[PDB]
Amino acid sequence: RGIFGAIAGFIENGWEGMVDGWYGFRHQNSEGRGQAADLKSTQAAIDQINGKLNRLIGKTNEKFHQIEKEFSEVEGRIQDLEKYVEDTKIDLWSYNAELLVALENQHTIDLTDSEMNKLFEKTKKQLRENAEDMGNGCFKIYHKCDNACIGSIRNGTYDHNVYRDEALNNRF
Amino acid sequence: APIGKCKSECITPNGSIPNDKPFQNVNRITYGACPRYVKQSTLKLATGMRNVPEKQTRGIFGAIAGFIENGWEGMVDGWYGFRHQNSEGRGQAADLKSTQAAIDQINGKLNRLIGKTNEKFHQIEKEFSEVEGRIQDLEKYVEDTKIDLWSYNAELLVALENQHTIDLTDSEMNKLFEKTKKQLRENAEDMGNGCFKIYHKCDNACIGSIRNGTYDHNVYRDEALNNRF
Amino acid sequence: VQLVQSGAEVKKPGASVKVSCKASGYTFTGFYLHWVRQAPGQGLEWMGWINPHSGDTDFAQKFQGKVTMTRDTSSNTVYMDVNRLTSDDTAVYYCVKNDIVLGMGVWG
Amino acid sequence: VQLVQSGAEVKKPGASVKVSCKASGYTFTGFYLHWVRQAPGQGLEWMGWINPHSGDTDFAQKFQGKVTMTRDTSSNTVYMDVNRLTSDDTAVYYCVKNDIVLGMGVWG
């Protein structure tokens, strides 16, 4: 970003160089910038994705005997009817496949985005009055957070009543 | 099957069958306005919302949360509801408007399918007791393809309707939560466990006013910020 | 939601008495269970409560040590063992499914 | 993410030297590129950084005017031109893909 740089995420900038997991965290304080990953959210996402994928793969049905689908002669009306029913079945299944792929892609893209709107609202609830949404993708915490407070927020153990006495003193 | 006396719209080789459902498993040969035939042994439409069994015990103190961590047991007044705690004691109530809207939408969705079958008076023969050749094989093939296509359509329709019902009956509760937050404005803070914490001295009348929508936040906004800030 | 009991036994003074309360129709580990007793001519005398989700129990002001209770989650039931029988402790025992917002709830 | 270079040329004192750094495996215009050099028996001497998204550059305290660098986005590469060669400037030149949170990143 010009000469200073950018740190935003999930709203204006996807993160490169993070193979720990899908969803993650970053922070800035007097102990230096860092990066971490949330195993619970990425594990839930991976489990849902794997279940969705296993729904289709390996669940085929037996089709031992069918009609002849290739011809090398003109025969009449019954051959034309067989070709017509073959074409109609193929067209219907092609439309079904395209619609299924579109629906599954739409639902996956919205699921893996509502799961990040979640854990954002959840962190906002955990921080209560101690953090203000910057709007570029994440929060700004108004108390003197350290390397332990970030970990506590990541775990869910964070107790806002301790630092709520000074957060409003700093922000209001 | 022997012949008796009753009123029925569809006839199947097994016997009569009610028209009050959109699918069937009895047989693939029908006369009248019979429902569609599928292969699934069972199919369930979510005529209702998600279920979270109540865990009211929390060590020795107990729990009161709702809609986020704990579904409520012992409430037959309606689907969506309210609870409160103040100096006059804990209580429970129901919102008739939201549950009535949900019930109307659910009933419309259900009436969309039930009773709207189409006449199928004459069809091809779908059972055989002899080997005949290529035309019989073609009839069997078209029957199988139709049955498979309709089974996939039924499964997809049920999945779509269940997904939309479960999300509708949850966005309708995200609503009336945002609505209550707007009504309370600066006088309430979201605890995050499922509901609000109101910072003014609310009584049995203030809860009813909030439930009705008559609540006026300007009266108590003078002391809510005095208590919370 | 229903609570059944088994308390038809009779014992001599100084012996022990076991009473069983079986719950059905609701999530067993979700509500506090209460034990109370009633004697003729007297009001109901509350004894204690037990949380089926754990082992936590609480007793009255005069029922410390002389009465115990335990729970079996696999068979969704509770047992109460009372020892040191006395002539003044002859009464009928009631099992209660307490609810924090709907009151005392169902009885047995 | 990989950075390759071309710096095998040799020049007489007073001439000019061109060195090219080619980046692959990542979005070229997304990270600051750094130029550093190392001489035997000495620690690494950092020279400057360039933003491939624009023309902005920054130099060290003693590398003003004597060294320049430019970028080609269409071929995702950078060039460094150094003039006024001196005996004390004989060293090996390293190209770096800096990251603001993961450190110095990959080298060349």
Add this chain to the structure above:
Amino acid sequence: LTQPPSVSGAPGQRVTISCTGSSSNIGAGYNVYWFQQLPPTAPKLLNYGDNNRPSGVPDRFSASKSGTSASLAITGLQAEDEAEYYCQSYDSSLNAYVFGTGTKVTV
């Protein structure tokens, strides 16, 4: 918690029942309940968390709570009345749920 040891009323007449209390039990803002019972069989709950009914009780009973005392009134008295009533509440001085003592004769 206690109830007046005797109270009577002819059919068609209203009857009032009151519970005693102090700041520890009724003055702490906790709920109060009534139990209609026969001594040998079982009790049955009256009142509710709110001022409603547990959807099995006729409209003949009305309950109210005040700063220091609570009351139950029966207006449409019938012959189906099982004349035994006890109060019930929660105490803070002792952490046990406390029922009441009482006696009623219809006359």
Add this chain to the structure above:
Amino acid sequence: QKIPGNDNSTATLCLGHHAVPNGTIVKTITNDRIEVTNATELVQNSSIGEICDSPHQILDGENCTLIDALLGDPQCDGFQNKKWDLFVERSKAYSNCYP
């Protein structure tokens, strides 16, 4: 124990929804197994077992097929000039007069 005395200057209004212990399992497009309070079986897997002809007139070929009735045989001589909306043949039927 229990929660201490309700605070004099704070309310805790809460919102929620009903739940049942015998939650029925159902499948959606995102989750294969979820619990719902109420659900209806869409597929009718049971039959009454008898055929009745209130709205649709039904003819019963007790001992003959449709072709046997059409050609004219004694065992179905009561089928002359009849009309129907559905003809139900019996598996025990058999031609008698001529093969």
